[PDB]
Every structure is written in C-alpha cells, then in structure tokens.
Paper text:
We focused our attention on human RAD51, an ATP-dependent recombinase crucial for homologous recombination (HR) and for error-free repair of DNA double-strand breaks. We therefore explored the possibility of using a more stable orthologue as a surrogate and focused our efforts on archeal RadA from Pyrococcus furiosus, a protein that was already structurally characterised and is closely related to human RAD51. Here, we describe the complete process of generating robust, RAD51-like surrogate systems from this archeal protein via two distinct approaches: by stepwise mutation of the surface of the RadA to humanise the BRC4 binding area (HumRadA series of mutants) and by generating an archeal/human chimera (ChimRAD51) in which all of the BRC4 binding part of RAD51 is stabilised by parts of RadA.
The humanisation series could have ended with HumRadA22, which displays a fully humanised BRC4 binding surface. The crystal structure of HumRadA22 confirmed the success of the humanisation process and shows good agreement with the human RAD51 structure. The structures of those mutants, where the LFDE site has been humanised (HumRadA14 and 22), show good correlation with the human BRC4–RAD51 complex in this area for the backbone but some variation in the side-chain conformations. Whilst it was possible to obtain apo crystals of the fully humanised mutants (HumRadA22), the crystals were difficult to grow and handle and hence not well suited for drug discovery purposes.
Residue numbers in the entry: 108 to 285, 311 to 349
C-alpha cells in the first residue's frame, strides 16, 4: 500500500511531480508531436528497473503501443548510457501492440494475467505504458454522433487502468497526442513540462533535456 515513485530521469521534473511517477495512479503526459512524450515513456521503461536509491522500483515494465512509437534501439542506447546491459533492460520490457480500440481493452486483460504470474518473483511489474491512449478511439469514433460512445469507451479503459494500478501496486503512464502534464518544446531542444490541476501538488513548470540518457535536466 506504500505509493512507490519512479524517477523520470530529470530531477527538476521529479520535484514538480513530488518525487516522481506514482504507483497506484495514472500519470498522463500530453502535447504535440515531438514534445518528448515517447522519450519520457522510454526513459521510464529503463528507470523503473533500477533499485530505489538509483530511482527505480526493481521492477519490470509493460509497453502497449497503439501507433508504432516503441523504439527498442532507443531503449538500448538509454540502457547503455546509464551503464546497464541493453539486452537485459530489453528483456524486462513486455511489448504489445494494440491494433484497434477493442484490441486495446483486450490487452488489459492480458497485462492483468501477466502481472499475477510475475507477482511473487524478484522482478514484479511496476510500470505499464500506454502510448497514444486515445489514438484508436478517435480513429474509430469520428463525428458529433459518435462522441458519446468514444467518451464512454475511453472512460471504461481508464476505469480498467485504475483497477490494475491499485491491485498490482503499479504506475500507469499514458501519452496523449495534443495526473496531467502538458509537455512543450522549449528553446534549444529543451522541453518544458507544466503540471496542471494536481489536487496536492502546486502548479509549476520543469525544464529538462533529451539526451543519449533519454530524459535528464
């Protein structure tokens, strides 16, 4: 029942989030294409695996890809640049591609089954990534008349994500193309993260960089 924390790689971004990404909660990052959402997702996929003193929870990660954003070659560079074995870091990230919105919900029943199997092991799942959470729902429910249903399907998927985060004590990290964090391009390849409407965290901004290590100050 202790709320775990995952470092994002950047200490200024971790400060804004009150210590990092929370287990038993969903953290949403939104912004335009190229604002760093997937780089943050890839950095977290590595960070989670690290011991607490280094910013992780000694866990494994699951990655649900909706629009082919997963880059194992990028995860290998981040693992290498942080002094880890890239093939071992890769082995600890379960990847699954969602082809449609209904397949996306079905993937959560598979994540649930996988989480149970790895629960007693020395490396339980501590992170679930959903890259471009809303892309399939917007593709399939177009126009004024399918707005009610899209919102209904989306709310249902969010209810499911909340249940998994609470019963397995995992962080859920979701990305959303343009807890909520707005990402934006800053000056000189810098990125600005702005925290919006957090109940117990003040609004503020955090500037960070995209490097060979993924995300850092």
């Amino acid at each position: 029942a202790t709320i775990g924390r995952i470092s994002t790689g950047s200490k200024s971004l971790d400060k804004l989030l009150g210590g990092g990404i929370e287990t038993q909660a969903i953290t949403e990052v939104f912004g335009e294409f190229g604002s760093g959402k997937t780089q943050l997702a890839h950095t977290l996929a590595v960070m989670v695996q690290l011991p607490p003193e280094e910013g992780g929870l000694n866990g494994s990660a699951m990655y649900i890809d909706t629009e082919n954003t997963f880059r194992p070659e990028r995860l290998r560079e981040i693992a290498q640049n942080r002094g880890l074995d890239p093939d071992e870091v890769l082995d600890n990230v379960a990847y699954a591609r969602a082809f449609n919105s209904n397949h996306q919900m079905q993937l959560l029943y598979q994540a649930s089954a996988m989480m149970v199997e790895s629960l007693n092991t020395d490396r339980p799942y501590k992170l679930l990534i959903v890259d471009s959470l809303t892309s399939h729902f917007r593709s399939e429910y177009i126009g004024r008349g399918a707005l009610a249903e899209r919102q209904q399907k989306l709310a249902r998927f969010l209810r499911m994500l909340h249940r998994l985060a609470n019963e397995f004590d995992i962080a859920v990290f979701v990305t959303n193309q343009v807890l909520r964090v707005y990402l934006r391009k800053g000056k000189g390849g810098k990125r600005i993260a702005r925290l919006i409407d957090a109940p117990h965290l003040p609004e503020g901004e955090a500037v960070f960089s995209i490097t060979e290590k993924g995300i850092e100050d």
